[PDB]
């Protein structure tokens, strides 16, 4: 299993638990988009409407080799590209 810490900030507030995703295989960015939106919903009550109307709604992947990738949660043109989650160090999620 591969563990990936992530942080959620919504409307300038970050709850101070420590949260991780656990991955087993390769995935499309759209699957990470879904995991992120699912946690936005289940942790902070964020709806599709909230995301779509927000000033900013993104997640940033930091890879183990230091590269960062910013993904727009409103429209991700890279949804269909793949990534091996074992290369992911952590994920920063920001809405508003």
């Amino acid at each position: 299993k591969h563990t990936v810490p992530y942080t959620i900030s919504v409307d300038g507030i970050t709850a101070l638990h420590r949260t991780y995703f656990v991955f087993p295989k390769k995935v499309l960015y759209q699957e990470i988009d879904s995991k992120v939106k699912n946690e936005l919903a289940s942790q902070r009550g964020v709806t599709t409407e909230k995301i779509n109307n927000a000033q900013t709604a993104t997640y940033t992947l930091t890879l183990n080799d230091g590269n960062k990738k910013v993904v727009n949660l409103k429209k991700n043109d890279d949804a269909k590209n793949s990534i091996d989650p074992s290369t992911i160090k952590q994920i920063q999620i920001v809405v508003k």
């Binding site: 563990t3 990936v4 300038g12 507030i13 970050t14 709850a15 991780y20 946690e39 920063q92």
Partner: protein, 223 residues
């Protein structure tokens, strides 16, 4: 804990370490024992299996003082609001009562509606991260100053001084941080607060649940 020091082992025998199952991973929180069968924590720490470790100092080692107990029942406050993180308090009923001893003992709660003046120095403890790059295997603690409500009203639009506490001088690198949620704010050996939320940066002030605003619910739920 940002900016703190290692706690003296077993000096805070009410401290609990929580391991929480979620649909796509796991979470980690603090908590604190309030009766031999109940731990208080934050409602945002709820999940679909919760394990409680009491008696710990180094949570990554197998210490014979540790007691590992599953939560039988996890009771979030009925008015918990995940969007604004209001009423962020939860009781865990333990599957078995603890073995009370020098290493595992409950902490005192405040009196009903007890206040906490701006300027009061308090202590928070936990096993959370200590910076953006490192964590801790051992319990750490830091002293923070209660702030005037004005400070958090300006930073956090949903802050409510009737049910929350504004904690931490922005000018010091001292704060509760990721993984410290649910741990206590101790002021003169009484748990007045529960670590709730702040900024991803870790820069204070931070917001704590005001325990004394929830004593009727705490008492009813434990009865």
């Amino acid at each position: 804990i940002i900016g703190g020091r290692e706690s003296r082992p077993h000096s805070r025998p009410y401290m609990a370490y929580l391991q929480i199952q979620s649909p796509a991973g796991q979470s980690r929180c603090g908590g604190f024992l309030v009766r031999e069968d109940f731990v208080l924590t934050a409602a945002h720490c709820w999940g679909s299996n919760i394990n409680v470790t009491l008696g710990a100092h180094n949570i990554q080692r197998r210490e014979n003082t540790q007691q590992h107990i599953t939560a039988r029942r996890a009771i979030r406050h009925p008015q918990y609001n995940q969007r604004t993180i209001q009423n962020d308090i939860m009781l865990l009923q333990l599957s078995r009562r603890v073995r009370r001893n020098r290493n595992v003992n409950p902490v005192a709660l405040p009196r009903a509606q007890e206040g906490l003046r701006p300027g009061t120095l308090c202590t928070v403890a936990g096993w959370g991260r200590v910076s953006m790059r490192r964590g801790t295997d051992t319990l750490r603690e830091v002293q923070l100053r209660v702030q005037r409500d004005r400070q958090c009203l300006r930073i956090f639009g949903s802050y409510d001084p009737r049910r929350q506490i504004c904690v931490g001088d922005r000018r010091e690198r001292k704060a509760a941080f990721k993984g410290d949620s649910g741990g206590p704010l101790l002021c003169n050996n009484v748990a007045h607060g529960i670590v709730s939320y702040g900024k991803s940066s870790g820069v204070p002030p931070e917001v704590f649940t005001r325990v004394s605003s929830f004593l009727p619910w705490i008492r009813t739920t434990m009865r």
